[PDB]
Every structure is written in C-alpha cells, then in structure tokens.
C-alpha cells in the first residue's frame, strides 16, 4: 500500500512513512526481509517507479541509523538471485543422481563470512526488547537438487550453534502468493490456539517462512525429513503402490485416464473399472517407520487430524489444484504441508477441466485414516474445527479484504497464468473494475461458504462437514477431474 501513492495528498504519505518507521526501529529482522522484495523487484543481470522511489526512501531512512549491515543482506539476496539466474539445464537436469555437486562461480556466495542478522530459518517474536541470539556464523554451498518441476535448487545454511537447514531457491516461479497468503495459515493457527476448547488437542497447521526476492523468484524453507508422497507411493523404483503389489501396474493408470480425457459418457465406467482393480496402500506408511505401537498410533492420529484440519482450511481459503506433488508429509511428525500453492483461492471452478473436489482427499488418504475411515475421527475433528471460526466470523474475513486490495495482486485469472501450469500435462499426454467485481464476488463466496451453503439452507456444522466429505469421495465426480490430479 505504501508503494501505491507516495506523492498524494498532504498528510497521508507523511503518516504512512512515520508509521512504517517504528517497525524498522523495533523489529528490523521482520522488515529487512520484506523491504528487499520491493527494493530488488526488478533486478535483471545479463506504478513501478513509485515502488522504486518508496524502496529508495525506506533504504535511506534505514541506513541513516542502522549499522553497515544494510547492504550485507542486499548482497546476500543478490547472491540468491545469481543462484536462481545462473542455473542451466545442461548441468543439473540429469546429473542429480545421489551425489551433491557444488557450483564453482558462486564460491561461498562471493566469499561471505558471517551476517549480524539471522536468515529465514527461524525467529521467535519479542515482547518489547531487542534480540540478537541467533545469527549467521558461517555458510557452505553444496547445491543439492531433489525435484524436477523447474530446475529446483536446494542449498544448506549453517548459522549459529552449528545447525544444518535446507533452503529452496525457485526459478521462473511466482512465489509472491506463496509468501503473502501463506501467513493466513499461521493466522488461523493463532485463531484456533486462542480458543480454550481447541487447545486440549493440537490440530495445528505447520507453517514455513517464505521471503520473496523478485518476479518469478522466491526462497522457501525445506524441513529436514520431508518427502512428498508423489515420489514415495506412486513410482516405478520406490513406491509402496508398485514395489509391494507386483500384480497391478503403476504407469498405465495415467495412460488410461489420458485415453478417457480425449472423449465423457464412459468416464464413470472407466473410473469404476480403474478403481475396482486398484486399492489404496497408503495405510502402510506409518508402521513401516515406527515399530512401537504407541508412537505409531500417535503419528497416525496426528496425520488424520492434520489432514482433517487442512481440508477445512483449504475449503475456507480456496487454494485449489492440489496435485500429488504439492502435498508434503513429514517423517518425524506426520503432518501434511502445502508447498506449491500454484493457483489462487477461487480458480479451479473457472479453469479448463474444472476441479470438483474442493480439497485433496483420495482413496490413499481415506485409507491412511486406518480402519474406521472418515466416520470415526475425521468428520468429528472437522465439525470440531469448523465451529472455531463461527464464534469469530468478524475476524477471519478481515485478512482476505486487506490482502486483496494490494497493487501487486496476481490472483485473477490471466490468459497465461491459467495455462502455463496446465500445458505441461497436456504436453505429456500429447508426447480494471472487473478485478474489483471478481474480488467482491469471491468475498461474497467465502462469506457464504461458512455458516451457510449455496443452496440457501442453514447447513450447520452437523451437515456442512458431511457435505464436504461427500464432495470428496465420489467416483462420479472423480471421473470428471483432471487426469494429472490422481494417478
């Protein structure tokens, strides 16, 4: 908002610059990671003017009092930009394997030694006092690569106390949304934590810090011991769906759906024929890692409650297009984390091949619940966590209205953004006032989603969670889904 009008009126910009000053005065670690997102938003080596002027003013006001560490973080972020730009496909596309080869021209991020401020790893909020407990002590460059979406880069940082943490640098990927709307998850976590009834159990949504660098670039956190189920369950060399059941196939499951998408009338028949011979094997994910039954039960109940809370969080905050690669399960805590978040809140019902299921719940997930399924714990946890925001309806809606009135918004359906993330499965198969109108429309949609339904009835927590879980397990609608959604 400060980047919108820095020269307007008489006192507006003045009070805005006076209010954005005390934050940089008291918590510089919270603001130096967000000022760079607009100070280096157009850095290309080898409207926006007002944003650049505001960035220059903020830098000039910060450097006047703050010590010489102001440009150290700028150089550190330029190092990440160089990491995200210099990467080439002729070097680390088929050279991943198992070794971790470093990169020569980077050379310890242009030979850095230590930073006075901590990195994106972790930070505990203060209550009025300054804190410099955790900082950067050293750094090592190994250039790990585990992924194939768009040449992902994985690096490691060793700050104070000597702890190795993995970071993810993305290239040609818009991570601005993954940084502005991801904080809504921790907001809802704090909302459910304030409630005393919702504190007997955890049902917490795990969050991860994300700092954006520029357009089509971003840096997110990678927790140690997190492997996505897309490469752990459905895979040719390592996956419980194939290495355990040799009778059935794994690859032709996608081909059968690609041969059906070409047609519509036989969609339900093809889905039934594919599901009658294929059962879920995701339930064997917990006992293969914890032999002790107590910890096994703890992990399975934590996973069930985590997915039950994430389903409702996704339903209330949109975030459609939940493929098998985005959902990330943790090994030491058994919690599902959304890492991609490619599309906006309300975009699945308007894109080609529209999404029907409002969240991610397949046969693998419904079998991971155990022996009772959804009726036992899933639906009860859902109806318990759905009423935590009905008592505070006038609070959770205030975040969307303030995150949608930003100038850098990219949630509307663009002719290129709605197809650049869907043309890859197609290639694998083939071997303005309108913005404000849509904003008000989706605001009314999210207002009618909770404590009500589009049918006009009340549909309280006793029936809303049942409707949500019935919109998930329905083969007639799953046959109308995208082929790349479920293998």
């Amino acid at each position: 908002r400060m980047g919108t009008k820095m020269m307007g009126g008489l006192g507006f910009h003045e009070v805005l610059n006076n209010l954005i000053s005390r934050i940089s005065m008291d918590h510089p670690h919270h603001t130096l990671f967000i000022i760079l997102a607009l100070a280096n938003a157009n850095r290309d080596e080898f409207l926006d003017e007002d944003r650049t002027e505001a960035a220059n003013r903020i830098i000039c006001t910060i450097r006047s009092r703050r010590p010489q560490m102001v440009r150290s973080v700028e150089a550190l972020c330029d190092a990440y930009i160089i990491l995200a730009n210099l990467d080439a496909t002729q070097w680390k596309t088929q050279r991943k394997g198992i070794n971790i080869p470093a990169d020569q021209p980077i050379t310890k991020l242009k030979n850095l030694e230590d930073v006075v401020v901590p990195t994106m790893e972790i930070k505990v909020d203060h209550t009025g006092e300054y804190g410099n407990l955790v900082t950067i002590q050293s750094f090592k460059a190994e250039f790990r690569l585990a992924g194939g979406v768009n040449l992902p880069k994985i690096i490691d940082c060793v700050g104070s106390d000597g702890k190795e943490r993995r970071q993810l640098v993305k290239g040609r990927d818009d991570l601005r949304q993954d940084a502005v709307m991801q904080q809504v998850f921790q907001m809802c976590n704090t909302l459910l934590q304030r409630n005393t009834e919702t504190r007997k159990r955890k049902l917490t949504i795990c969050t991860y810090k994300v700092v954006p660098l520029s357009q089509r670039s971003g840096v997110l956190e990678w927790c140690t011991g997190t492997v996505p189920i897309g490469e752990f369950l459905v895979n040719n060399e390592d996956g419980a769906h194939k290495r355990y059941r040799p009778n059935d196939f794994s690859a032709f499951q996608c081909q059968k759906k690609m041969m059906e998408v070409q047609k519509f009338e036989e969609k339900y028949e093809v889905f039934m024929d594919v599901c009658q011979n294929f059962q879920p094997v995701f339930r064997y994910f917990c006992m293969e890692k914890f032999l002790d039954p107590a910890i096994w039960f703890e992990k399975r109940l934590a996973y069930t409650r985590s997915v039950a809370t994430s389903s409702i969080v996704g339903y209330i905050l949109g975030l459609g297009d939940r493929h098998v690669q985005n959902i990330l399960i943790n090994e030491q805590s058994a919690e599902l984390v959304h890492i991609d978040l490619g599309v906006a809140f309300e975009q699945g019902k308007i894109l080609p091949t529209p999404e029907t299921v409002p969240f991610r719940l397949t046969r693998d997930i419904v079998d991971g619940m155990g022996i009772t399924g959804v009726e036992g714990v899933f639906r009860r946890c859902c109806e318990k966590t759905m009423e935590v925001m009905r008592n505070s309806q006038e609070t959770l809606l205030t975040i969307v209205e303030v995150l949608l009135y930003d100038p850098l918004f990219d949630w509307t359906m663009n002719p290129l953004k709605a197809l650049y993330l869907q043309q890859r499965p197609e290639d694998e198969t083939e071997l303005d006032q309108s913005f404000n109108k849509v904003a008000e429309r989706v605001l009314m949609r999210l207002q009618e989603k909770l404590k009500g339904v589009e049918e006009g009835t009340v549909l309280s927590v006793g029936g809303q969670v049942n409707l949500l879980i019935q919109q998930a397990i329905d083969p007639k609608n799953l046959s109308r889904l995208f082929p790349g959604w479920k293998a």
Binding site: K200, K202, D292, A294, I295, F297, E298, L301
Partner: protein, 133 residues
C-alpha cells in the same frame, strides 16, 4: 547441608534443573523417598511451572508423571510401600496434556543397536545377563 551446597553450587535449579534432577536420578532403589519429598516444594514455583508447560509445544516435559508412576510400581513390589507412595503422590500437577501415549524412554538398547549383523541379540542377552548382579 553439604549435599545441598554441592547440588546448588553455581546453579539455582528452579525452572528446569529442579525437575531434571528428580527426573534423571531415577536409577536408585525403590526407597527413593527423598526426591519425592524434595519435589513437594514445587508449589512455590507455580508461575515458572505454568510458563514451562506453556512453552512446551511438543511431546515432552511430561516425563515426571511417568517417572512417578514407575517409582510407585517399583515400590508396590518391594516392602514399606506406604510412605513411598504417600511421598510419590505429591505431583500437584494436572496439566499433563499434548500427548496420546508415553514412550518407554529407553536409550541403552538404542545405543547398543549400532551393530547391523545378527549379533545384536547376543549383545542384548549379554547385557541383560550382566545387568543382574
């Protein structure tokens, strides 16, 4: 007095060490009626105990109840278990939450399981035979 001066040497042992000294010294006999009697002074540190229980966001910091239950079970088998259980029934804590099942908290076998061959069972049997003395 000498034992207290040696235990409180350059250490307050109020917030966490006061409970760690009683939770890590559970390798004595069944007549450990001294630690249970000394832990009764935790009522004066309720403000610190509440903060320590609120800061715990994982499955930990609640091993005190498991240690007390193990001590009570060990004293029920031996003799003079009346005063032992009376001293052990002074937890004065009712916020043991954020858990579904307590683990065994055994590390001797985890440290010895470093071997990968079939000789791990022989090492475990040898350790179990040497433990009885």
């Amino acid at each position: 007095h000498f034992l207290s001066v040696s235990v409180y040497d350059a250490l307050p042992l109020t917030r966490l060490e006061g409970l760690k000294d009683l939770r890590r010294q559970l390798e004595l006999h069944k007549d450990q009626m001294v630690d249970i009697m000394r832990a009764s002074q935790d009522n004066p540190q309720d403000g610190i105990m509440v903060k320590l229980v609120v800061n715990l966001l994982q499955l930990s910091k609640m091993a005190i109840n498991h240690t007390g239950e193990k001590e009570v079970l060990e004293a029920v088998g031996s003799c003079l278990g009346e005063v032992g259980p009376i001293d052990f029934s002074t937890i004065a804590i009712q916020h043991s939450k954020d858990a579904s099942y307590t683990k065994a908290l055994k590390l001797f076998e985890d440290k010895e399981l470093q071997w990968t061959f079939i000789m791990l069972t022989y090492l475990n049997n040898t350790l179990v035979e040497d433990c009885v003395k």
